[PDB]
Chains A and B, each alone.
With several copies, the nearest count.
Chain A
Amino acid sequence: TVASISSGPKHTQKVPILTANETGATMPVLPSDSIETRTTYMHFNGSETDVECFLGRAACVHVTEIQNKDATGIDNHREAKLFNDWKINLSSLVQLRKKLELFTYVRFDSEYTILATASQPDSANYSSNLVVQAMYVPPGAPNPKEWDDYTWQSASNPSVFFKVGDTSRFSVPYVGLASAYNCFYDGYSHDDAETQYGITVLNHMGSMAFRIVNEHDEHKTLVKIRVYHRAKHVEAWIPRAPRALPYTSIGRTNYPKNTEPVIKKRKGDIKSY
């Protein structure tokens, strides 16, 4: 492939460099339309800018935490982090968010990796070996109330059991309702006068729930869960302007008030170098 062809002096009536940008086109002008060039080859394919590659590496999408401790006398397991949940969403963390929001609709399978590490902030004789249980409560499913409920039975709910310190991994098809995931949605659930606005109304795919299978030892053990997400088989439509201001909420476009100028002011003139 040639990156530049050889081109010499020109004295024409045919001027490729004068255009009318009002038309909305970006005319494909090249170095050889306005200087004299020599042949050179590309030596490159643009492999690593493919959208599959761009969205295809694992990104941290969520960090939660649960603890193993005596539940005796706990009136609210959920509240004691005897077990937590993550109401599946990819808008939490902004690193992967900005990347995704470069497009309007996106379609992909997900591969999740879940790393779990334990901490024992206060005096323990040892490090126990705990087994985590991650179960996906599809919307319209009995939500775990306790840490050893009947829900954890998950007889129809896909669940994975792995050891703390270890990692769990699996992949999920694209479980979108539509033909693709809406990165943006300028509409509402229904024609109400108070109903929410955005995608937060469209992206209601239940939540994930973690818990430690093991009973309690004499000390307490903090287990912190990190969920990583990798898109595989990516398809993206309609590019948009990149995010400039900071994010404030999962699912709304809102930016913070009295934010700071995002364009760097010159130290000098327009004329400055």
Chain B
Amino acid sequence: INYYKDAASTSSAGQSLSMDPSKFTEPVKDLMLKGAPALN
């Protein structure tokens, strides 16, 4: 129950439960498959 009118006044947000490290761990242009050779 929100007792207040504005959105800033609500409690903390709830877990992204998004999670996708590939923008950070695999930003390569041509896709690399694990097990296939790195450099062909």
- Interface residues of chain A, those whose CB is within 8 Å of chain B, are 14-16, 18-20, 23-29, 33, 45-47, 50-53, 56, 109, 171-174, 232-234, 239
Question: Can you list the 4 inter-chain pairs with the closest CB atoms, starting with the nearest?
Answer: A20-B38, A173-B8, A109-B8, A14-B35
B35–A56 CB distance below 8 A:
no
| Cβ-defined partner of A52 (8 Å) among B16, B32, B36, B38 | B16
Given known pairs A47-B15, A52-B15, the reply for A24 and B9 (CB within 8 Å) is: no
B32–A23 CB distance below 8 A:
yes
| Cβ-defined partner of A25 (8 Å) among B9, B15, B28, B37 | B28
A15–B6 CB distance below 8 A:
no
| Cβ-defined partner of A33 (8 Å) among B12, B17, B34, B39 | B34
A173–B38 CB distance below 8 A:
no
B38–A23 CB distance below 8 A:
yes
User: B7 at interface (Cβ–Cβ under 8 A)?
Assistant: yes
| Cβ-defined partner of B38 (8 Å) among A14, A19, A33, A239 | A19
Q: Which residues of B contact A27 (CB under 8 A)?
A: 26, 32, 34
Given known pairs A20-B39, A52-B16, the reply for A174 and B28 (CB within 8 Å) is: no
**Cα distance A16–B9 when bound, in Å?**
50
**Cα distance A56–B12 when bound, in Å?**
7
A25–B34 CB distance below 8 A:
no
Q: In the assembled complex, how far is the CB of residue A271 from the closest CB belonging to chain B, in whole angstroms?
A: 30
| Cβ-defined partner of B12 (8 Å) among A14, A29, A52, A239 | A52
**Cα distance A18–B32 when bound, in Å?**
12
Q: Which of B17-40 contact A (CB under 8 A)?
A: 17, 19, 24-28, 32, 34-39
- Interface residues of chain B, those whose CB is within 8 Å of chain A, are 6-17, 19, 24-28, 32, 34-39
**Count of A-B contacts judged by CB separation below 8 Å:** 68
Closest to A21 in B: B38
Q: Which residues of B contact A47 (CB under 8 A)?
A: 15
Given known pairs A24-B28, A173-B6, A173-B7, the reply for A16 and B15 (CB within 8 Å) is: no
**Cα distance A134–B24 when bound, in Å?**
39
Given known pairs A20-B38, A27-B32, A28-B34, the reply for A174 and B26 (CB within 8 Å) is: no
Given known pairs A46-B19, A52-B13, A232-B13, the reply for A174 and B8 (CB within 8 Å) is: yes
Q: In the assembled complex, how far is the CB of residue B4 from the closest CB belonging to chain A, in whole angstroms?
A: 9
Other CB < 8 Å A-B pairs besides A16-B34, A19-B38, A171-B9, 16 of them? A14-B36, A20-B38, A20-B39, A26-B26, A28-B26, A28-B34, A45-B17, A47-B15, A51-B16, A52-B13, A56-B13, A232-B8, A232-B13, A233-B12, A234-B13, A239-B24
Q: Which residues of A contact B24 (CB under 8 A)?
A: 239
Q: Which residues of B contact A26 (CB under 8 A)?
A: 25-26
Closest to A20 in B: B38
Closest to A28 in B: B34
Closest to B39 in A: A20
Q: Which residues of B contact A53 (CB under 8 A)?
A: 12, 15
